[model samples]
Target chain A: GEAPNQALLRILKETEFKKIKVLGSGAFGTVYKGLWIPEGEKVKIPVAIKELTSPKANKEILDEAYVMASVDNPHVCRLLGICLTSTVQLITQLMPFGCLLDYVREHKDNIGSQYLLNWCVQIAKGMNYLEDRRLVHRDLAARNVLVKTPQHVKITDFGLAKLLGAEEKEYHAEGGKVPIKWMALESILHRIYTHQSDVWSYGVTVWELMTFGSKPYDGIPASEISSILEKGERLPQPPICTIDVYMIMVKCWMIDADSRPKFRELIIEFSKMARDPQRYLVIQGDDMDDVVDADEYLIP
Target chain B: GEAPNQALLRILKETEFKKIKVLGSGAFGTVYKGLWIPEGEKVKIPVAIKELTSPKANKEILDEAYVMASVDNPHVCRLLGICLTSTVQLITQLMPFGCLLDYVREHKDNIGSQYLLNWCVQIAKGMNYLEDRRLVHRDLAARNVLVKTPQHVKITDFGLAKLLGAEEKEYHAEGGKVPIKWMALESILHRIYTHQSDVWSYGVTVWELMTFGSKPYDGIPASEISSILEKGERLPQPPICTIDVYMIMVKCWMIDADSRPKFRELIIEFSKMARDPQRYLVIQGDDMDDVVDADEYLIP
Candidate 1:
């Protein structure tokens, strides 16, 4: 009644949660498949209620909500509202297909190469949006991605996202808790994150797409990754990936942070090749020493 | 002319497998969802083909098959036959419901306390069979247990099983590759695996079943577990588990090797309680300091 601006700041009521059932629990939170109803609404909406159960729940709970509220894209998980309860609950859209990693594992044979490339493009498009907003998505692996359909992929888990200042180009992380396998060379060595580090993660995501979500750098220990990167070693091309597409991943993982292509450039490249696949899908000479017989060995 | 014992030994032809598709891959092996047609039969059978891809593939591949062959119970996975392929493949009866841990998580909402009780009893029955033959299952947890249905559970992953000699009471493991959280006091301290060690693992398994497969000792580190166990601390009762049912787990986790009840006794107790739930499910006085308000916190 006071102003139209006040309408946008509506509070989420706890009583609106019609039904709650635990879906799964992870390292820091429990996810519940919930049926939520808004105030003055007769229909209930299916939602995912993520409750942080870690000791640092209070410190990080609202931070996740705030970051989620800032992001709005077709390929990013939409934040509905937050319910103030025990610790805090971040109400968001429920992903029917769950995480992309598990989805790919469950339907490995059925998922075609064309679909995987499309998912790559969609993720790139999503990351491009984040890049435009100057959001450094520190964790951008396949496990953090969700799928509404094979084509409609969404980037999720903004828990590790670092929203930078308008003037800032990069953000340096303080804590040592990082996804080491998915980290860029600079990020792993000095904990510096930027659009390029996110680019590095996107490259890994594409590799995950190509390999049906196989673990990045299999047989490699996390502790040894820093030294391995120092020696200029990166992830090898996935077995099913085309040479042209594999080069895109290689470019994203360039040693020089500035040399790495932006998410904007990646979307165009992936889109161009995906649209006209006859030329792009053709075989090319395997010239790289890093190339492994991934097809010969069992992907574990 | 052949002896009657000749029927026990039969050659497994590699040609029997008709179709193959990868289901999932783990640290050292790749599991495939396969269709098998035996030599003289037109009928096809669904099977799970597990192939060891680790560097120690040849050494451990046959060991897993040998252990699977020795165990035969209604509550245990059956080893159909072995196929001599690129490395070696062990074919087992396909579990339609997959691993019990994931099954519990997916059906957490619909699963009744009665169904959970039945699963616990089935697992106990399976362990009782192994204990009778003096075979120690070093790694017995919900993750290794397979579910055909809610009432039918089968114990699998015999990779870590130690087939003890007729005269021997225990087997001292040499490698450091032991499930720390599931180990008994003696097993953790001395790397000694026995019937009692298996019972301790069964206690952890029961805890896993009660909590819908939550990580054992959620926040505790593996390095600190030895010291923690020495102080006589064990997993507390899950929020949904009754006091009477949790006492069965407590008996299995007794500090003294001889003090723990035999798997045969455990089966009888669990079967009795499951059959007569009205007497077992009643509320009791909470008298332990270790008892936690697991209901208050979100399970992670």
Candidate 2:
């Protein structure tokens, strides 16, 4: 339904919909956090509205809209409705808190082992759902993962999403330039992709989560970083990164994409490890009381 | 003395200087071209006013000011007086035609060999004056050489001038991060200064004069040019540069600073060559009539 500029608001003002607030924006458009109002009542119901920019409001946008509309899971951010007009706006569940990137950056010092474990589990579950449905969230990063509440996380921002079928084979062979530092070696050199490429990016996502939202090339120029990555260089293992996490990252960055672990297996493995909160704790015992050098925690 | 913000206008009025106009400027302050009215003058005279910035009013400014004050030569721009009150001002004879850089940039094709030869000879005379005084001008490029008239050249700008004394050692051992492409091999590799280094920059100045004010490192990146100079790279011979002129440049850029020809010797040699203008004539012969392709003149 269209109210032109206030199309989304028109939908919210309807008897069936409730309160709405904008969340964040991406390459495509702005996302909003809103409520699905019940019949004859003004109730607090949470939803997310993904608005599509003018040029992108085509069949490709419809494909992603249709895909999210079909999904029915607690792991992923569910679609609520569509506002079609001058600008196409997609309504979904409103995520009260921000994306994983903002959350990690803001609460790095206070982030506990339990929180990391829960977030990782939620991300893996969402990945598993996407994989099962033969869909690829080609541009998955910390920014794509949203925290609906303190305890709940959902995957969003499907700008680069692609559905896998025989028809997808034509586009799969065509290589595109992505951030080489975040990509696996094969993806960078040969422009090949699979569920495994996502795993490699996922490992970077995990590192971002653990490192308080530090970027891939923290201090380096993009050109220099790309050159280093082209020559098979990897990020240095920082002191805070545990051996287990380091091993996981190494496995994800393997030269052969086929050798990488699947999302279903990763979900079970990470979930089991995440069960013991003390194992993955960033700070240990009375270490916090030792007047830790603030400089030591600074990235690069 | 101590004229307010109106000091500029007041100085003009007090000197009865007419036809006041701006010439050029640098990091220090503005320079103006005006008419100088000396004590008991009947008619207004032509002069240049170098207005000093606040920071350059102290002893540091006097360093260059003292050097210019001592130089008494027909080929050099004459320093009349220095104002020592609120704003420091150096009054000098006005060179109506302005700098050689501006002249070359504007009228490269129109000017004849007589004018060019006279200009070169005047520059050599000024160079001889500085050398005789045991002072080396560290920055003797095209812009510093002023064209007072069509057939008269005068040396200006002593910002990078340095005095030579008994305590000072070899001339080729006082280097810093000067523009590498303009420097001689000895100056680039070793932090050295000599009359020879000035001669090398002078050769570049001649190239600028002949090429209609083409800059050194015209088509190359500054960093690459610096690296090439550090590695003792030499510029390729220009097609239009005459053999005699080329020989003089080669001598100026001699690897051994002591072996390079002195400005006094160069003045005598160039003056003899300048007398024979036919030797450097640009004729429209068969070579000029040939339908030369655009790519033929492409820089390597």
Top candidate (DockQ): 1
- Categorize the docking of model 2: incorrect
Show where candidate 2 strays beyond 4 Å. Answer: A1-20, A38-44, A166-180, A224-226, A284-300, B1-300
**Candidate 1 per-residue C-alpha lDDT over B1-300 given as tens digits, one digit per residue, 9 for 90 to 100:** 322222132346777775467878877678987766665644556778887645676778777777787677888875777877777888887886899999888877777666777887888888888887678989999989997766788999988888777778999889678779988989888888898888889988888877877998899989999998888888988877678888888888888888988888887887887776656553332122332221122212
Write the residue-wise lDDT of candidate 2 on B204-291 in tens digits. Answer: 7777776667777778876676567656665655444577766777777666677788888878877887787647644222012332
TM-score of the candidate numbered 2? 0.43
| Model 1 lDDT at residue A267 | 83
**TM-score winner:** 1
Candidate 1: which stretches are off by over 4 Å?
A1-300, B1-10, B53-55, B278-300
The per-prediction tally of clashing pairs is 0, 16
Write model 1 residue lDDT over A1-300, tens digit each, in one string.
221212122247789875467889877678998776555534456778887646676778777777787777888885778887766788877776889999988887677666777788899889989887778889999989987766688999888888777678889889679999888988887889998999988888888877777898789889998898788887887776678988999998888989989888888888888786645543232123332221122212
TM-score of chain A of 1: 0.88
DockQ of candidate 1 against the true complex = 0.01
For all candidates in order, the CA lDDT equals 0.78, 0.67
